[PDB]
Amino acid sequence: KSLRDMSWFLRYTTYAIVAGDPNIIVVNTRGLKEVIENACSIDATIVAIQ
Amino acid sequence: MRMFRITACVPSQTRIRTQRELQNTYFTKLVPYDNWFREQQRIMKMGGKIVKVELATGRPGTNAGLA
Amino acid sequence: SIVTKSIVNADAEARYLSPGELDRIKAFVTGGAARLRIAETLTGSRETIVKQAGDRLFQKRPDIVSPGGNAYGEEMTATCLRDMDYYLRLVTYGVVSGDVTPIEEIGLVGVREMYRSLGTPIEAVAQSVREMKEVASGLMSSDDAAEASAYFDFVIGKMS
Amino acid sequence: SIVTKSIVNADAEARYLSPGELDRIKAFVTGGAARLRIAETLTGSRETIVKQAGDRLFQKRPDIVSPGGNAYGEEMTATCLRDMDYYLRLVTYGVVSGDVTPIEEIGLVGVREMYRSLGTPIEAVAQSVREMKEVASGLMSSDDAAEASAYFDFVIGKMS
Amino acid sequence: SIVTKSIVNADAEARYLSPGELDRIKAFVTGGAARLRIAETLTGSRETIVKQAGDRLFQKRPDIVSPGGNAYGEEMTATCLRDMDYYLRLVTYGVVSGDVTPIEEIGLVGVREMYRSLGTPIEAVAQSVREMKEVASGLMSSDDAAEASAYFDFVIGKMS
Amino acid sequence: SIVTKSIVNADAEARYLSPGELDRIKAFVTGGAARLRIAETLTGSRETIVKQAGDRLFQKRPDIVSPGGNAYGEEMTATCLRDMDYYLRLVTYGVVSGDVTPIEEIGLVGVREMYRSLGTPIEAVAQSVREMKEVASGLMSSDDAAEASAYFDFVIGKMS
Amino acid sequence: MRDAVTTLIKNYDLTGRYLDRNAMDELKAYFESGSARIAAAAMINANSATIVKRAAAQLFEEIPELIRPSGNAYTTRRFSACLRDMDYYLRYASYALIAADNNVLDERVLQGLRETYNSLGVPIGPTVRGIQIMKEMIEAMAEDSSLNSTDFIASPFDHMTRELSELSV
Amino acid sequence: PSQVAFASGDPIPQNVARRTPGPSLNRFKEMARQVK
Amino acid sequence: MQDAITAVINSADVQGKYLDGAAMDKLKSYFASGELRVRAASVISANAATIVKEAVAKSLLYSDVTRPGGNMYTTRRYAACIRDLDYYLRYATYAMLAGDASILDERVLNGLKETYNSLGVPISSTVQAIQAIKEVTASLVGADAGKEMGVYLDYICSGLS
Amino acid sequence: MQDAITAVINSADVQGKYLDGAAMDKLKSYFASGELRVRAASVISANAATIVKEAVAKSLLYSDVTRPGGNMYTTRRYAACIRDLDYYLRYATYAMLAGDASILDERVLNGLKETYNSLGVPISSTVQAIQAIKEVTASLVGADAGKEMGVYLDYICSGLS
Amino acid sequence: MQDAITAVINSADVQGKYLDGAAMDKLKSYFASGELRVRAASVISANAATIVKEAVAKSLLYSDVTRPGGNMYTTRRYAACIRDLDYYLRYATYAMLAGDASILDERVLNGLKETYNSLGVPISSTVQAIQAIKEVTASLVGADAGKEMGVYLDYICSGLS
Amino acid sequence: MQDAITAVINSADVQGKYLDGAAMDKLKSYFASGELRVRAASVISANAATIVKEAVAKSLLYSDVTRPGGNMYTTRRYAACIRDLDYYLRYATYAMLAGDASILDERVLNGLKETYNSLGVPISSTVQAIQAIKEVTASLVGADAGKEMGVYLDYICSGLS
Ligand SMILES: *[C@@H](C)[C@H]1/C(=C/c2[nH]c(/C=C3N=C(/C=C4\NC(=O)C(CC)=C4C)C(C)=C\3CCC(=O)O)c(CCC(=O)O)c2C)NC(=O)[C@@H]1C
Ligand SMILES: *[C@@H](C)[C@H]1/C(=C/c2[nH]c(/C=C3N=C(/C=C4\NC(=O)C(CC)=C4C)C(C)=C\3CCC(=O)O)c(CCC(=O)O)c2C)NC(=O)[C@@H]1C
Ligand SMILES: *[C@H](C)[C@H]1/C(=C/c2[nH]c(/C=C3N=C(/C=C4\NC(=O)C(CC)=C4C)C(C)=C\3CCC(=O)O)c(CCC(=O)O)c2C)NC(=O)[C@@H]1C
Ligand SMILES: *[C@H](C)[C@H]1/C(=C/c2[nH]c(/C=C3N=C(/C=C4\NC(=O)C(CC)=C4C)C(C)=C\3CCC(=O)O)c(CCC(=O)O)c2C)NC(=O)[C@@H]1C
Ligand SMILES: *[C@H](C)[C@H]1/C(=C/c2[nH]c(/C=C3N=C(/C=C4\NC(=O)C(CC)=C4C)C(C)=C\3CCC(=O)O)c(CCC(=O)O)c2C)NC(=O)[C@@H]1C
Ligand SMILES: *[C@H](C)[C@H]1/C(=C/c2[nH]c(/C=C3N=C(/C=C4\NC(=O)C(CC)=C4C)C(C)=C\3CCC(=O)O)c(CCC(=O)O)c2C)NC(=O)[C@@H]1C
Ligand SMILES: *[C@H](C)[C@H]1/C(=C/c2[nH]c(/C=C3N=C(/C=C4\NC(=O)C(CC)=C4C)C(C)=C\3CCC(=O)O)c(CCC(=O)O)c2C)NC(=O)[C@@H]1C
Ligand SMILES: *[C@H](C)[C@H]1/C(=C/c2[nH]c(/C=C3N=C(/C=C4\NC(=O)C(CC)=C4C)C(C)=C\3CCC(=O)O)c(CCC(=O)O)c2C)NC(=O)[C@@H]1C
Ligand SMILES: *[C@H](C)[C@H]1/C(=C/c2[nH]c(/C=C3N=C(/C=C4\NC(=O)C(CC)=C4C)C(C)=C\3CCC(=O)O)c(CCC(=O)O)c2C)NC(=O)[C@@H]1C
C-alpha cells in the first residue's frame, strides 16, 4: 500500500504537471491525512514527499 | 424453395365445435421445407394422423439451388 | 447465384426484374471472365494454399495439434485439411456464382452446431479460413484478391 | 436507393451485408458518374421532353383534350404538363439513386387510387411517360438512354 | 424453488395447488434439514471439490492449459477455477431450493452464446462439472450424492 | 407519529437522532400502554359515544335538523352520524399515534372547503365534535379524559 | 414518511375500520419492542464512525478491485464519497430501526438509488455487500452487548439489499 | 500552418490493454499455482 | 416471483457467496412455517368457492352495487367480480405458500388500479370484498394462518389504495 | 431454383470435384448469352402489358371462347385467364434470364395440368394463346432472342399440354 | 431511414425542385467516399464478433459489472449485453454504409433510453462499452473509416446520454 | 465536460500507468496545434456575425423556410435561428479548442434532438445551415482551420441527422 501510494503520488504529480492546474492534487490530497494516519506514519509520508 | 404437399386428419378432443369443421379437420396443404418440421410437430402433438406427404416441388439430394 | 437471388426476389415481390438488378446481372455477366480467371487460379493453386494455411494455423494455435485437442494424430489433421479443401471449394463456387447462396446451401447452415457436436472450435475454423484468405491474397493478384477475399471474409464472418 | 434496399434486406435477415450486395454498392458507386450525367442532361433539357411528349400525346390521344375529356381545358392541360414534369423529376431521382424505390414511394404507390379519384386515364398517363422516354432516348446517347429507359420501364410497368 | 415452480405451474393452469405438490412441499420441508446438510457439506468442501475436479479436468484435457488454449496461463486458469466455484455454488443453490430454477436462471440460459464470445469449450466445462460430480460423490455419502447428482446431471444436460 | 416527527427532525438537519429525540421516543413508548387503553375504550364505546353526542348535538342545535336545515331527513341524519363516527375513528387513530397528524392528514385538510361545498355548518360540526369530547371524557379517568380531549380540541381548533 | 404505527393506521383507514384486537396486538408488540429498538439505536449512535470505517476496511478487502485503478472507489474523493454513502445508509438504517418500518428507507434511500448509481457508474453489488457487512457488524455488536432482542436489526439492511439489488432469480 | 489539424488530421491510436483478473481472484491464482 | 427460499438465494447470489448461518436460520424458519402454510393452502383450495360465496353474500349482495345502476348488476359483471375474487383468493394462497408478496407485485397489482379505473370498477367496494374474503378465510382456517392470509390480502388492498 | 451456374455447381458437387474445363465451357456460353438475355428481358418488361393485350385481342377476342357458352365468358374467368397469361409471360421471362426451365418445372408445372383438366380449361386454346404470345415476343424482341424465348415458351407449352 | 442520396432526394422533393449544383456536389462527395465505406463494411463484417470480444474484454471483463451484483453477472445478462453490442455494431455499420445516422434514430435510439431506464441498465457502462467498440474498430478498420465509425458510435452514445 | 488532456489523463488513470508512448504523442500534437487553434478562435470570435450572415444568405434565405408557411417566417423565429447558429459556431469553437466533442455531447446534443422535434425545426435545413457555416469558416479562416472546425461542425450535423 505504501509503495503504490508513493508511485501514485508521483503519477498524480506528473498528471497535474501536464494539466497545468493543481486541482487534482488538491482534491485527492486535502482529506487524505485522517484516513492515512490510522495505519501509516504521517511524518514518514511528509519526509517521503519531501 | 422446395415445398411439401401433405394430407392429414386432425380430430377434436376437448370441445364439440358446433360450426363446420371438415375443412380444418381433413385438408391437403402446401407447407414450406423450413416450416414442415414445426408444422408436422404441431399437428402431431395435436394428435392427428397424416395419411400422405410428398415433395410437390424440388428434387431429393439437392446440394445447391433448392431455394 | 446472383441471378437466382434476383429471380427469387422478383418472384417473391411478384414483379419483373428491377433496373438495378438487371444492371447487376449485366455487369456480372461481363465480369464473369475475370471471375473464372480467379477460379482457375484457385483450382490450379489449391493445394499449396491449404498446406501453408494449415501449417500457419498449427503454429498459431498448437492446442489443436496438442494431445487432448480436436485434431490429435495425422489422420485427424488430414481430416481438418480435407475440411479446409471443402471450404476452399465452396469459396470457388461462391466466386463463380457471384453470390454466397452456394456456401449457404452447402457449408454454412448448421455449421455452428455441427462443430459443436464434433467438438471442433469454430473460432479456430475461422482462423483457418483467415490463413487461407491471407495466403491466397499473397499468392494471386491483389485486384482479384480483393474480390476473392470478400467471399473469403464473408465465410470468416459466418464462421465466427 | 440501392444502399437503403440492401441495408433493409440485411436488417430483415439480421445479418451484415453480403459481398454480392457490397459488390452492387461498389459498382453503383463507381458507375454513378454516368447517372449524374444523365440526370444533368435531363434537368438541363427538362422543358423540352415535356414539350415534345405533350405534343405527341395530344396527337396520339386527342380524346384527352377533346370536350368531355379529363384534360380538356387550358388549366387542365397545364396540370397535365405539371404531372409530366413531376414524373420526369422522379425519373431523374431514380437515375441518381440507382434504385426505383424513391419513384415507388413518391409517385407509384396509390397512383391508381389518385387518378381514379381524379378521373384520369392511367394508360394515357403511361403513354405520356412512354413518349417522354422516346424523347429522352432521342436526346441522349445510346448506352446512357438504354440505361435510363429502365426507370421509365418500371414506371410503365406500374402504371399500365 | 419447488414452491415457486409448483405455483408457476398452477398459475399457468389457472388452478390451486393439488394435494400432490402439497405433499411434495410437505416432504421438502421435512427433508430441509437433510438438504441443508448437503449444503454445509459442499460449503465446507468448497475449496476441495473444485480443486480435485480442476486437477482431473486439466489432466484429462491438456489442450485447455496448452498454449493457444482458452485457459492458458495463471490468470486464465484462475478465472476457470472461479467459474468452477461459481457452478459449484449454483449446484449448492439448486440442492437448497429443491428445483433447478436457481441454477438455470443464473448459469444456464444464454451460456452457449456467453461462452462463444470467450471461446470457452462447452464440452470441456461440462466435463469439469462431471468431475465436480464424481469428487462430490467421492467425499459425500451415497444417496445424498444421488440427490446432488440429479442437479449436477441437469447442469450437464443443459450445458452439453 | 411522534417517532415520525423525531426521525424527520433529525433527518432534516442530516444527523442521527438526538438524545432529546431519544427521550421523547422513550416517553412515547412508556405512554403507549395508557394511549392504547384510551384508544381501546374509545373503540369499545364507539357506538354509544356517537349516539349520545349526536342526541346532545341535535337537542342543542335543532336548526340543522329542522326542515330547511342541512341534515333534515333520516338519510341526512344517518350521514351526519356517519361523519361523527368518522371523526371518532380519526380521534382513535390520533390517540394511537400519540399526536394529531393522522387526523390532520385524513380529515382536517380541506375540511372547510369540503363542508362549504356540502353546505354544512362547520361550527355545528365543531359542536358535534365538542359533544363527542364531553361524552368520551365522561367515560374515562381524568388524565385519560384530558389526553383524549387534547386531540378533540385539536379537531375543534381545526374546524373553528 | 410512515412508521409501523402510521402504516397500520393507513391500512385500517383504507378499509375504514376501527382498530380491532389484532391491531391492538400489533401496537402492543411494537411498544414492548420499542425499548430494545431505542437501546439498539443508542448503541449504533455511539459506534457509527467505527462501523462505517471497519465496513470499508472489510469491503475493500473482500472486493479489492474497488481501490485498484478503474475501480469506482479509487481516488480519495471517491473513497470519501463512498464512506459518506455508507454513513447515509447507516443513518437511515438507524431511522428504520427506530420506526420499525422500511417506508423511510423506500422514500428517502431506494427510490432513485439505481438511477443515481447507473448514472455515475457506481456498482450495486459491492454496495449491498457493504450493507450486509454493516448488518453483520451491528448484529455481532448487539450479540456482544446486553441486547435481549436482536431479531429486528437485520430487517432494514435485508430490505435495502432486496430493494436495491438486481433480481438474480 | 498545416499543423492546425489535430482532430481533422490522422488520429493517434492509443495502446489500451485487456483487463486482467484482479486481486479478488488471489485465492484462485494461488489455487492455480498449486495446481500447476 | 420469489419465495423466502429464492429471496435468500438471491441475497446470497448477488453477494456471490454461499449460504451462511443466518441464511440457514431463515430457511429453517420457513420450513417450520411450511406445515401451517400447506395445511392452510389445502383448506382454502378445498373450500375455494365457499369463501367467495360467503364474502359476496356478506359485502356485495343486496346493495346498490348489485342493484341496477351498480357495476355488479349485469350478470357478466357479476361473474367477472366472482372471477376477480377467485383471483385474489388464489394469488393470496400463492403468496401465503411463498411467504412473500412478489407474486402479487408482479401479476396482481401490475396496473390493476388503471384496469379498474378504465373499466369503472368500484375500488372501495372491491376493497370491502377483499376484506370480507379476509374475514371468511380467518374464520375458516384459524387465527395464525388467517392472519398470514390477511397480510397478503391487506397487501392487495394497499396496492389497490 | 436451378440455373446454368447452379447446375454447374451441383454437377461439380455430385462427385465432389472442382470445376473442370467441360463445366467451364457451358458457363462461358452462359456468360456470352447473358447480355442478350438481359436485353430481351428489358424489352419484354417494357412491353409486358401490351404484348398480352395485343395477343389476346388478335388471338381469342370476339370468338367462341369469350362468347357466352365459352370458358372465358365471365369477367372473373376473363381476369383469371389474363392473370394466367401474364404469369406465363413473366415466368418464361424468368426462365429466359435464368437459362433453365427448372423455374417453370418448380413454380408453374407443379400440379397445373390436373388443375386445368379438373376445371375444364381448354388445352388447345391455351396452346394458341402461348403461340400468339411467342410470335408477338419474337416479332418484338428480335429473331434470335425471340427464338430463345420461344424455346422456354414451347417447353412450358408442351409441359402444360 | 435514408442514406445521403435519399436525404438529398427528399430535401429536393420537399423543396419541389430538381437537383441543383450543390446537390450534385454532395452526391459526388458520397460517390467519392463510397469505396472506403464498402471496404470498411467488409472488414467489420469479417471481424464482427471479434470486435465485440476485444471491446468487452477491453472495458467490462473483470469489473464490477461482471462481478456478482453487477448487471452482467448472470449468463442471460451477459448474453443480452453481447446481443446489445452486436446490435450497436451492426447498426453502426449500416449507418456507415448509408452515410447517415437516420437508421440509428428509426431503429435504435427511438426508445432505447426508456428501455434501459426501465431495465436498470447502466448507460455509463454501455457508453464505455461503445467507446471500447470505437477503439477496437478503429484499430482494425483504418483511419477515415475509423473516423466515420467513431462519429456514428458517438452518435449512439449521445442518444444514450 | 472534458477535453483531450482530461481524456488522456483519465485513460492513463483507468490503466493505472503513466503516459508511456502515445499519450505523449497526442498531447504534443494538441499543444502543437493549440496556438493556431487559438488564432482561429480569435478570428471566428472577431468576425462571428459575418459567418452567420453569409451562412443564412447562402443556404436559408429566399426559400420556403423564410416565406410564409415556413419555420423561419416570423421575426422571433428568425432571431432564434440566428441565435442557434451563433450557438453552433460558439460551441464548435469550444470543442475545437478543447480537442474533444464532450462539450457538444453534454451542452448541445443532450437535448437538441428533442427540442427540434418538439418545436418542428427542419432537420435538413438546419444541416444545410451548418454546412453553410462550415464552408464560410473554411473560406474566412483557412483550409486547415476550416477542417478543424468542420469536423466538429459535421459532428453537430451528425447529431442533427
Ligand atoms: C425596405 C423595406 C428596406 C429593405 C429591405 C430588405 N429586406 C431584405 C431581406 C429580408 N427581410 C425579411 C423580413 C421579414 N420577413 C417576414 O416574414 C417578416 C415579418 C412579417 C419580416 C420583417 C426577410 C425574411 C428577408 C430575407 C429574404 C427572404 O425572404 O429570405 C433585403 C435583402 C437583403 C439581402 O442581403 O438579401 C432587403 C434589401 N432594405 C432597405 O434598405 C430598405 C430600408
Ligand atoms: C436555424 C438555426 C433554424 C431554426 C431554428 C429555430 N430555433 C428556435 C428556438 C430554439 N432553439 C433552441 C436550442 C438551443 N438552446 C440552447 O440553449 C442550446 C445549446 C446552447 C440550443 C441548441 C431552443 C431551446 C429554442 C426555443 C427557445 C429559444 O429561443 O431558445 C426557433 C423558434 C421556435 C419557435 O416557434 O419559437 C427556431 C425557428 N429554424 C429553422 O427553420 C432553421 C433551419
Ligand atoms: C353419427 C351419425 C355417427 C358417427 C359419428 C362420429 N362423428 C365423429 C366425428 C366427426 N364428424 C365430422 C363431420 C363433419 N364436420 C363438418 O364440419 C361437417 C359438415 C358440416 C361434417 C359432416 C368430423 C369432421 C369429425 C371429426 C371430429 C370433429 O368434431 O371435427 C366421430 C369421431 C369422434 C372422435 O374422433 O373420437 C364419430 C364416432 N359414428 C357413428 O357410429 C354414428 C352412426
Ligand atoms: C474453466 C472450467 C473453463 C474456462 C473458463 C474461463 N472463463 C472465463 C471467463 C468468464 N466466464 C464467465 C462466466 C460466468 N460468470 C458468472 O458470474 C457465471 C454464473 C455464476 C458464469 C457462468 C465470465 C463472465 C467470464 C468473464 C470474466 C469476468 O468475470 O469478467 C475465462 C477467461 C477468458 C478471457 O478472455 O479472460 C476462462 C479461461 N476456460 C476453459 O477452457 C475451461 C474449460
Ligand atoms: C505509509 C508510510 C504509506 C501509506 C500506506 C497506506 N495506504 C493505505 C491506503 C490508502 N492510500 C490512499 C491514498 C491515496 N488516495 C489518492 O487519491 C492518492 C493520490 C493523491 C493517494 C496516494 C487511500 C485513499 C487509501 C485507502 C484505500 C485503501 O484501503 O487502500 C493504507 C491503509 C489504510 C487503512 O488500512 O486504514 C496504508 C496503511 N500511504 C502513504 O501515503 C505512505 C506512502
Ligand atoms: C327464481 C327463478 C330462482 C331463484 C332465485 C334467486 N336468485 C337469488 C339471487 C340473485 N340472483 C341474481 C341475478 C341477476 N341479477 C341481474 O341483474 C340479472 C339479469 C337482469 C340476474 C339474472 C342476483 C344479483 C342475486 C343476488 C341478489 C342481490 O341483489 O344481492 C336468490 C337469493 C340467494 C341468496 O342466498 O340470497 C334466489 C333465491 N332461486 C330458485 O330456487 C329459483 C330457481
Ligand atoms: C361501352 C359502355 C364502353 C366500352 C366498350 C367496349 N367493350 C369492348 C369489348 C369487350 N368488353 C368485354 C367485357 C364483358 N364480358 C362479359 O362477360 C360482360 C358482361 C357481363 C362484359 C361487359 C369483353 C369480353 C370484350 C371483348 C369482346 C369479346 O367478346 O371478345 C370494347 C373493345 C375493346 C377492343 O380493344 O376492341 C369496347 C371499346 N368502351 C367505352 O369507351 C365505353 C365506355
Ligand atoms: C387463359 C389462357 C385460358 C383459361 C384460363 C383460366 N384460368 C382460370 C383460373 C385459374 N388458373 C389457376 C392456375 C394457376 N395458379 C398459379 O399459381 C399459376 C401460374 C403458376 C396458374 C396458371 C388458378 C389457381 C385459377 C383460379 C381457380 C378458380 O377458379 O378459383 C380460369 C377460371 C376457372 C373458373 O372456374 O373460374 C380460366 C377460365 N381458360 C380459357 O378459356 C382461356 C383461353
Ligand atoms: C451491455 C452493453 C450492457 C447492458 C445490457 C443489457 N441489456 C439488457 C436487456 C435489454 N436491452 C434491450 C435493448 C434493445 N431494444 C432494442 O430494440 C435494441 C436494438 C435496437 C436493443 C439493443 C432490451 C429490449 C432488453 C430486454 C431483453 C430482456 O427482456 O431480457 C440486459 C438484461 C437485463 C435483464 O435481463 O434483467 C442487459 C444486461 N447492461 C450492462 O450492464 C452491460 C454493460
How many other CB atoms are found less than 10 A from the CB of residue J49? 17
Whether K100 lines ligand 9, by a CB cut-off of 6 Å, is no
Pocket test for ligand 1, best of L50, L54, L61, L77 (most atoms within 8 A of CB): L61
- Give the distance from residue C58's alpha carbon to the nearest chain E alpha carbon, in angstroms: 10
Q: What does the buried/exposed string (b/e) look like for L15-27 if buried means 16 or more CB atoms within 10 Å of the residue's CB? A: bbeebeeebeebb
| Residue B3: strand, helix, or coil | strand
Per DSSP, K115 falls in state H
Domain segments of chain J: what residues?
A: 1-161
G abuts E (3+ Cβ pairs < 8 Å):
yes
Residue I120: which residues within 8 A CB-CB, separation 6 or more?
I71
Among all residues of chain K, which has the CA nearest to that of G119?
K124
Q: Choose among F4, F22, F106: nearest Cβ to G13.
A: F106
Let me know how long chain H is: 36
Question: Residue K7: its chain L contacts at CB < 8 A?
Answer: 124, 161
Task: Tell me phi and psi for residue I111, to 5 degrees.
Answer: 75, 20
Q: How far apart are CA D1 and CA E104, in angstroms?
A: 46
CA dist., res. C59 & res. C74, Å (int) = 15
Q: Is A3 on the interface with L (CB under 8 A)?
A: no
G87 close to G108: Cβ distance less than 8 angstroms: no
Distance in Å, alpha carbon of L122 to nearest chain H alpha carbon: 28
**Ligand 7 pocket at CB < 6 A:** J 57, 61-62, 66, 73-75, 78
- The finding on whether K73 has its CB within 6 A of some atom of ligand 4 is yes
Q: Would you call C150 an interface residue with chain K, using a CB distance cutoff of 8 Å?
A: yes
For the CA of L73, the nearest atom of ligand 1: 17
Cβ distance of L9 and A19 shorter than 8 Å:
yes
Phi then psi dihedrals of residue F100, to 5 deg: -110, 0
What residues of chain C lie within 8 A of the CB of K42, using their CB? Answer: 150, 153
Which member of D22, D32, D89 has the closest CB to residue K31? Answer: D32
> At a CB cut-off of 8 Å and minimum separation 6, what does I51 contact?
I44, I89, I133, I136, I137, I140
The answer to whether residues H24 and I17 touch, using CB atoms and an 8 Å cutoff, is: no
Minimal Cβ distance to D16: which of C19, C27, C157:
C157
Quick one: CA dihedral G143, G149, G154, G156, positive or negative? negative
The ligand with the least distance to the CA atom of K81 is 9
Please give the C-alpha separations between residue G89 and each of D123, F137, G133, I143, K70, in angstroms, as whole numbers.
79, 45, 12, 37, 19
Among F117, F103, F118, residue whose Cα is nearest residue F157: F103
Which residues, 6 or more positions from E76, have their beta carbon under 8 angstroms from its beta carbon? E70, H21
8 Å CB contact of G168 and E101: no
**If residue F137 lies in a helix (H) or strand (E), which one and from where to where?**
helix F122-137
Element (H, E) at D110: none
Q: Is E148:E43 a contact under the CB 8 Å cutoff?
A: no
Minimal Cβ distance to L64: which of K15, K151, K157: K15
Contact between G67 and G78 (Cβ < 8 Å): no
The per-residue DSSP string of K9-78 comes to HHHHHHHT----HHHHHHHHHHHHHHHHHHHHHHHHHHTHHHHHHHHHHHHTTTSTTTSTTSTT-SHHHH
User: Does the beta-carbon distance from L14 to G68 stay under 8 Å?
Assistant: no
b/e burial code for range C105-141 (CB count within 10 A of at least 16 → b) = bbbbeebeeebbeeebbbbbbbbbbbbbbbbbbeebe
DSSP states of J65-100: TTSTTSTT-SHHHHHHHHHHHHHHHHHHHHHHHHTS
Question: Which residue's C-alpha cell is 366472482?
Answer: I82
CA distance C144 to C35: 8
Partner chains of H (3+ C-beta pairs under 8 Å) = E, G, K, L
Rounded Cα distance, F57 and H1, in Å: 98
Pairs across F and G, CB distance < 8 A: 84
Q: How far apart are CA K123 and CA K113, in angstroms?
A: 8
All 3 cell numbers of residue G162?
Answer: 432486496
Report CB contact under 8 Å: E77, H20: no
Which residue type, as a one-letter code, is found at position G158?
D
CB atoms within 10 A of CB L132: 21
Binding-site residue set of K for (2R,3E)-phycocyanobilin: 81
Task: Round to whole Å and give the CA distance between E44 and J71.
Answer: 89
CA distance D79 to A40: 91
* Grid coordinates belonging to G24: 391492538
J108 lines ligand 8 (CB under 6 A): yes
Beta strand B26-32 with B3-9 is antiparallel
Cell of J125: 386454346
How far is the C-alpha of F80 from the C-alpha of F75, rounded, in Å? 9
C-alpha cell at B25: 379437420
Q: Tell me, using a 6 A CB cutoff, whether residue B67 lines ligand 3.
A: no
CA distance A45 to G146: 42
Compute, in angstroms, the gap from residue G75 CA to the centroid of ligand 5. Answer: 10
Locus of grid cell 400432490: E20
Q: What is the 3-state secondary structure (H, E, C) of C2-68?
A: HHHHHHHHHHHHCCCCCHHHHHHHHHHHHHHHHHHHHHHHHHHCHHHHHHHHHHHHHHHCCCCCCCC
Regarding the beta carbon of J71 and ligand 8, being less than 6 Å apart is answered yes
- Report the DSSP beta bridge partners of residue B55: B4
Does ligand 4 come within 6 angstroms of the Cβ of K58? no
To the nearest whole angstrom, how far is the Cα of G157 from the nearest Cα of chain I? 11
Cell numbers for J100 = 433453365
For cell 437503403, name the residue.
D4
Q: How far apart are CA L127 and CA L133, in angstroms?
A: 10
> Cell numbers of A30, please?
486535502
- If one residue of B18, B21, B23 were mutated to test the ligand 3 pocket, choosing by the most ligand atoms within 8 A of its CB, it would be B21
Alpha carbon dihedral L36, L40, L45, L48, in 10-degree steps, equals 180
What does the angle CA B8 – CA B13 – CA B17 come to, to the nearest 5 degrees?
90
Query: What CA–CA distance (Å, rounded) separates J59 from C43?
Result: 54
The answer, for H1 touching chain G at a CB cutoff of 8 Å, is no
Chain L residues in contact with H1 (beta carbon < 8 A)? 36, 142, 144
d(CA D138, CA D49): 10
Residue B48 Cβ inside 6 Å of ligand 3? The answer reads no
- CA K122 from centroid of its chain's CA atoms: 18
Ligand 5 pocket member A39 (CB < 6 A): yes
Distance CA I129, CA F2 (A): 34
CA-based nearest residue to C31, from D148, J2, D24: D24
- J111 φψ region: left (φ > 0), alpha (ψ -120 to 50), beta (else): left
Any residues with CB less than 8 A from the CB of C13 and at least 6 apart, and which?
none
- Strand pairing partners for B5? B30, B54
Q: Obtained via which technique?
A: cryo-EM
Query: From CA L152, how far away is CA D71, in angstroms rounded?
Result: 53
Cα of K59 vs centre of ligand 5, distance in Å, is: 26
| Cα gap I48→I83, rounded to integer Å | 12
State how far the Cα of G57 lies from the Cα of G38, in Å rounded to an integer. 28
Bridge-based pairing of strands B26-32 and B49-55 is unpaired
Length of chain E: 160
Query: Residue length, chain L?
Result: 161
Nearest C-alpha to atom 29 of ligand 7 is from which residue?
Answer: J62
- CA closest to H2 among chain L residues: L144
CA distance G14 to G23: 14
C-alpha cell, B15: 370441445
Q: Measure the CA–CA gap between D101 and D107, rounded to whole angstroms.
A: 10
What gap in Å lies between CA A46 and CA J111, rounded to an integer? Answer: 96
Q: Phi/psi zone of residue E98: left (φ > 0), alpha (ψ -120 to 50 degrees), beta?
A: left
Provide the grid cell at D124. 394515357
Report the distance separating Cα A24 and Cα A13, nearest Å. Answer: 9
Rounded CA separation I4/L109 (Å): 47
How far are the Cα atoms of D88, D90, I44, J83 from residue D113, in angstroms, in the given order?
Answer: 21, 19, 64, 21
HSE, side-chain direction, 13 A CA sphere, residue A46: 5
Cell for L100?
A: 474533444
The DSSP line for I18-82 is ---HHHHHHHHHHHHHHHHHHHHHHHHHHTHHHHHHHHIIIIITTSTTTSTTSTT-SHHHHHHHH
* φ, ψ at K66 (rounded to 5°): -90, -10
Cβ–Cβ < 8 Å for G44, F22: no
State how far the Cα of G118 lies from the Cα of G126, in Å rounded to an integer: 14
Under 8 Å between Cβ of G60 and A1: no
One-letter amino acid at D98 equals G
Atom of ligand 6 nearest to the CA of I63: 30
Chains that touch G (3 or more CB pairs under 8 A): A, E, F, H, I, K, L
Does G87 carry a binding-site annotation? Answer: no
- Report helix, strand or coil for B51: strand
Among the partner residues E51, E54, E82, nearest to H25 by beta-carbon distance: E82
Contact I9, E93 (CB under 8 A): yes
- The position carrying cell 455515475 is G120
Q: In b/e form, how buried is each residue of F22-53, taking b as 16+ CB within 10 angstroms?
A: bebbeebbeebeebbebbbbbbebbeebbebb
I39 contact partners, CB below 8 Å, separation of at least 6: I145
Are L101 and L6 contacting, i.e. CB atoms less than 8 angstroms apart? no
Q: Are D28 and D147 in contact (CB under 8 A)?
A: no
Cβ–Cβ contacts within 10 Å for residue J50, how many? 16
Residue nearest to atom 19 of ligand 2 (CA): L108
Strands laid side by side in the B49-55 sheet: B26-32, B3-9, B49-55
What the block records as the C-alpha cell of A34 is 485522517
DSSP string for residues in I110-158? SSHHHHHHHHT--HHHHHHHHHHHHHHHHHHH-HHHHHHHHHHHHHHHH
Question: Which is it for the CA torsion K127, K131, K134, K137, positive or negative?
Answer: negative
Entry resolution in angstroms?
2.8
* Distance, CA of F103 to CA of F154 (rounded, Å): 9
What residue type is assigned to position G20 of the chain?
Answer: D
Other CB atoms within a 10 A radius of the CB of residue A22 amount to: 13
Q: Give residue D58's region: left, alpha or beta (phi > 0; psi -120 to 50).
A: alpha
Query: Rounded to a whole number, what is the distance in Å from the CA of D134 to chain K's nearest CA?
Result: 21
Residue type, E143: D
Residue whose grid cell is 468576425: L47
Burial of I105 (0-12, 13-18, 19+ CB in 10 A): middle
Angle at D42 between CA D38 and CA D47, to 5 degrees: 170
From chain J, the residues in CB contact with B3 under 8 A are: 110
Beta strands in L71-142 (DSSP E): none
On chain H, the residues whose CB falls within 8 A of the CB of L4 are 6
Grid coordinates given for J111: 400440379
User: Could you tell me which residues are beta bridge partners of residue B32?
Assistant: B3
Contact C49, C136 (CB under 8 A): yes
Distances from the Cα of G81 to the Cαs of G56, G78, G88, G120, G164, in angstroms?
Answer: 12, 5, 10, 12, 18
CB contact under 8 A, K58 and H16: yes
The rounded distance, in Å, linking the Cα atoms of L136 and L139 is 5
Does residue K113 have its Cβ closer than 6 Å to ligand 9? no
Alpha helices in chain D (DSSP H): 2-12, 19-44, 46-60, 74-97, 101-107, 111-118, 122-139, 142-159
Q: Which three cell numbers stand for residue L160?
A: 442533427
- Search chain C and give the residue with CA nearest J9: C93
Helix (H) or strand (E) holding B30: strand B26-32
C14 Ramachandran zone, left/alpha/beta (phi>0; psi -120 to 50): left
**Residue L62 near ligand 1, beta carbon < 6 Å:** yes
**CATH architecture observed for domain L1-161:** Orthogonal Bundle (1.10)
